A paper describes a structure:
In this work, we describe the identification and characterization of a Trypanosoma brucei FH receptor (FHR). FH blocks the complement cascade by accelerating the decay of C3 convertase (C3bBb), thus reducing C3b production, and by acting as a co-factor for factor I, which cleaves and inactivates C3b4. FH is composed of 20 tandem complement control protein (CCP) domains with 6, 7 and 20 binding self-cell-negative surface markers, whereas 1–4 and 19 bind C3b5–8. Here we have identified and characterized FHR, a receptor that binds FH in a manner that would enable FH to negatively regulate C3b and C3bBb preventing MAC formation.
The structure of the FHR bound to FH domain 5 was determined by X-ray crystallography. The ordered part of the FHR structure observed in the crystal starts at the mature N terminus (residue 25) and ends 14 residues before the predicted mature C terminus and GPI anchor (residue 237). FHR is an elongated three-helical bundle of ~90 Å similar to other trypanosome receptors, but has evolved a binding pocket for FH domain 5 through spreading apart of the membrane-distal ends of the long second and third helices. Domain 5 has a CCP fold as expected, with its N terminus pointing away from the plasma membrane. Two copies of FHR and two of FH domain 5 were present in the asymmetric unit of the crystal with each receptor contacting both copies of domain 5. Mutant 2 FHR resolved which interaction was representative of the physiological complex and which was due to crystal packing. That is, mutant 2 contained mutations E31A and Q34A within one of the possible interfaces; these alterations disrupted the receptor-ligand interaction by pulldown and also by SPR analysis, thus confirming that the interaction is mediated by the binding site containing these residues shown in Fig. 3. The single predicted N-linked glycosylation site in FHR is located at the extreme membrane-distal tip of the molecule and in this position the oligosaccharide could potentially reduce antibody accessibility of FHR molecules embedded in the trypanosome surface coat without interfering with FH binding. The location of the FH-binding site is informative about the mode of action; by binding FH domain 5 at a site distal to the plasma membrane, FH domains 1–4 are located in the likely location of deposited C3b at the periphery on the cell surface coat. The highest affinity interaction, with a similar KD to full-length FH, was between FHR and FH domains 4-5-6 with a KD of 167 nM and the KD for binding to domain 5 alone was 562 nM.
Numbering used by the authors:
A (entry chain A): 25 to 237
B (entry chain B): 264 to 322
Write the structure that this text describes.
Amino acid sequence: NDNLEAELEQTKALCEVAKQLRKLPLLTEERRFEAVGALEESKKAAKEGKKAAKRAEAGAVGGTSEQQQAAKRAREAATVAYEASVRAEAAAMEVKRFARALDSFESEYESVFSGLLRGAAEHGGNETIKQLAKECATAVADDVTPEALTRAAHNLRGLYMQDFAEEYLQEANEAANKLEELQKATAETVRAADAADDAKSEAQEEAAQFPEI
Amino acid sequence: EITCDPPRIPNGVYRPELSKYRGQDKITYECKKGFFPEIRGTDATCTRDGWVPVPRCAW
């Protein structure tokens, strides 16, 4: 019927949304791991930078002007590495915060969309509709971008007049923003981890001329 | 020649969504997080007496 065309368009929209909701917790975990890795590297760069500044300062005691300038430079880099590690702390904290928000969102809807599909698998109007929903039982999306999340939410909202589809769009719009901020926060942790490494290296190069402890 | 109007399921979602259903046409419904169905099953059939069993999502 056009009723079967409607139901097939509707089953496809449920399938697209369900696949994105199963991918979100896997994606947030990769970001959470990445932020944790970026932060711990920034803390290793700060610890190493502090050591170099200490090797330079002990070395430059009673030293020349072009030896005392080195310790001052290794000290300034050791603090720049420390300050970048502090910025990586704050960025990773945001990653955990946006990941939590997105995990509450996935939790709210994944079982609902999965159950609606299970119904279409068992009682779908056509064998095509039942086949699409059966294939979508455990399917996961390849990726989730804020734009893919809202597109699929608007598509569902256009096919389903039920209030649920409208409330899903409202929530998916909030989650698309949280997903965009999860990616900005991950880049900021990586940027600060690189900033701390560069400073560690500047401290280590200036301290190269002095003896180790 | 039995027909039903779409079910009205506050705090729930049914499928498929059609303007009119015919006798023996089945809908399946799910409840919002925090809500549970009145009956165990999530099925409802279009009969002479409306949707049977009646779909209801309770707190």
